[PDB]
């Protein structure tokens, strides 16, 4: 749980610092498949499966 919390805090910090990526990941969309693809492409490197 602590590891998950730290990862989530780091991700939130990254999103806050990187405005454009936050915009792209946050813009509402009926199909979330592109959102999932980009999120897993950018994060799978440095986050846990949960």
């Amino acid at each position: 749980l602590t590891n998950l919390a730290d990862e989530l805090a780091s991700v939130a910090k990254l999103l806050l610092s990187e405005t454009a990526l936050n915009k792209h990941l946050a813009e509402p969309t009926d199909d979330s498949a592109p959102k999932v693809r980009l999120l897993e492409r950018l994060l799978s490197d440095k986050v846990s499966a949960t």
């Binding site: 780091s10 910090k13 990254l14 990187e18 454009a20 990526l21 792209h24 592109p34 950018l42």
Partner: protein, 40 residues
């Protein structure tokens, strides 16, 4: 979670991943506002 400007490229693919259909986001007095349609 440190990541360099490489993340940049990703969004260029994402925007490049996406006929062009926009959505009306508000309308009034004969004026509409449409989100999307980047190539318009």
């Amino acid at each position: 979670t440190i990541s360099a400007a490489d993340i940049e490229g990703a969004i260029e693919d994402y925007v490049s991943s996406f006929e062009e259909i926009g959505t009306v986001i508000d309308a009034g007095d004969g004026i509409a506002h449409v989100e999307g349609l980047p190539s318009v």
